[PDB]
Enzyme design. Structure first.
Site, PDB file in Angstrom:
ATOM      1  N   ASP A 194       0.857  -1.169   0.000  1.00  0.00           N
ATOM      2  CA  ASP A 194       0.000   0.000   0.000  1.00  0.00           C
ATOM      3  C   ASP A 194       0.898   1.225   0.000  1.00  0.00           C
ATOM      4  OD1 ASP A 194       0.240   1.097   2.962  1.00  0.00           O
ATOM      5  OD2 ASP A 194       0.095  -1.094   3.061  1.00  0.00           O
ATOM      6  N   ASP A 196       1.105   5.362   1.287  1.00  0.00           N
ATOM      7  CA  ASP A 196       0.578   6.273   2.301  1.00  0.00           C
ATOM      8  C   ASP A 196       1.014   7.703   1.996  1.00  0.00           C
ATOM      9  OD1 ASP A 196      -0.513   4.232   4.156  1.00  0.00           O
ATOM     10  OD2 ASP A 196       1.600   3.581   4.120  1.00  0.00           O
ATOM     11  N   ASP A 252      -3.671   5.226   0.924  1.00  0.00           N
ATOM     12  CA  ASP A 252      -4.270   5.948   2.033  1.00  0.00           C
ATOM     13  C   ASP A 252      -3.903   7.411   1.935  1.00  0.00           C
ATOM     14  OD1 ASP A 252      -5.379   3.657   3.080  1.00  0.00           O
ATOM     15  OD2 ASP A 252      -3.626   3.249   4.318  1.00  0.00           O
TER      16      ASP A 252
HETATM   17 MG   LIG Z   1       1.685   1.520   4.419  1.00  0.00          MG
HETATM   18 NA    NA Z   2      -1.580   2.226   4.396  1.00  0.00          NA
END
Ligand SMILES: [Mg+2]
Ligand code: NA
Ligand code: NA
Length: 328
Positions: A194, A196, A252
């Site tokens: 992921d 961020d 995110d």
């Molecule tokens: Mg992360």
């Molecule tokens: Na994340």
DNA sequence: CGGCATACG
DNA sequence: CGTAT
DNA sequence: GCCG
């Protein structure tokens, strides 16, 4: 020689005890699947101690005096040193419970409690979950649809492309607003699962209401495969270009006022264990309450103003650690 | 023995 | 309940 | 599971 809290010692991304730390982290993960948060923490901490060592552990006596190594963690290392394998760790690896809980909890939208319930209902595979989709949340439906893409690591080249598209949307939503890469990539990871980002604006208060405006613009650009929708954290699935096609990626987005930006940057840069240890240290050793918004003195009833991460380490009496040394 | 980080969606 | 470091 |  080895401090007890992970925030008191540099922990690099790569180290000299990879196999030992991996084994302890299996037991930590398994403890979490059974709801034993205390054992999870101890095994996580013991693993992190080994990451912080300057050379390989080759003999059991080298564990003497290391924090978080008691009878259990020492036995794991002893068996690995002697036989190259720890029977308990291998028994966990091949157990149906561990494998299924790992599979289910890696789904976006599924935590330990949901996975455990499904396990107790007899469910074992992703296709088992697909066959009964009325029992799934919209979030879980998206996690299952995109599960294969989300299991594939993101590269730093991907991250740079994503950051440009986020900056474009952010610049239209609020000129002057900035985008900072956080999380594992800021700690130097070359891959991740992921991405961020932390968003702020140099004029205090101008960031209010920003994230909805950013999300609406990304969505209008066709880049959002999934998001929840006032708010300050967005957990998205983005459409990322690929040779002749594309893939889903977890992204995110977080907004903070500039007065809080050092605290939010520190928190969102991690690692997760580093932040738990840092907050534990702050409260237990310094009597100060730390979170991703600020640092509170409960005696004076005042918040510490920070202009930098360096400020925060100084206010806690800790030597500064760059992000690359926070890989606890 | 108590404690184990602390938020937001 | 989920999400995040 | 380990620390204080
Ligand atoms: Mg992360
Ligand atoms: Na994340
Ligand atoms: Na999950």
């Amino acid at each position: 020689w080895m401090p007890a809290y992970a925030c008191q010692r540099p922990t690099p991304l790569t180290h000299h005890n990879t196999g030992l730390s991996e084994a302890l982290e299996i037991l930590a993960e398994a403890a979490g699947f059974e709801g034993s948060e205390g054992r999870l923490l101890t095994f996580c901490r013991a693993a992190s101690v080994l990451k912080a060592l300057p050379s390989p552990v080759t003999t059991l006596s080298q564990l003497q005096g290391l924090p978080h190594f008691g009878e259990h963690s020492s036995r794991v290392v002893q068996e690995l040193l002697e036989h190259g394998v720890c029977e308990e760790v291998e028994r966990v690896r091949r157990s149906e419970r561990y494998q299924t809980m790992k599979l289910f909890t890696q789904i976006f939208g599924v935590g330990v409690k949901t996975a455990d319930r499904w396990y107790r209902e007899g469910l074992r595979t992703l296709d088992d979950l697909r066959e009964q989709p009325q029992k799934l949340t919209q979030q879980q439906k998206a996690g299952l649809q995109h599960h294969q893409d989300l299991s594939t690591p993101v590269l730093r080249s991907d991250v740079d492309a994503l950051q440009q598209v986020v900056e474009e949307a952010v610049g239209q939503a609020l000129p002057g607003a900035t985008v900072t890469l956080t999380g594992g990539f800021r700690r130097g990871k070359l891959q991740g699962h992921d991405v961020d980002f932390l968003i702020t604006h140099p004029k205090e208060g101008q960031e209010a209401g920003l994230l909805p405006r950013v999300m609406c613009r990304l969505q209008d650009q066709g880049l959002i495969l999934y998001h929840q929708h006032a708010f300050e954290r967005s957990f998205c699935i983005f459409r990322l270009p690929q040779p002749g096609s594309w893939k889903a990626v977890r992204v995110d987005l977080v907004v903070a006022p500039v007065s809080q930006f050092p605290f939010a940057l520190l928190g969102w840069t991690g690692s997760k264990l580093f932040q738990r240890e840092l907050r534990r240290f702050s409260r237990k050793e310094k009597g100060l309450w730390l979170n991703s918004h600020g640092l509170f003195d409960p005696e004076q009833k005042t918040f510490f103003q920070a202009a930098s991460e360096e400020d925060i380490f100084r206010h806690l009496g800790l030597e500064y650690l760059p992000p690359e040394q926070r890989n606890a």
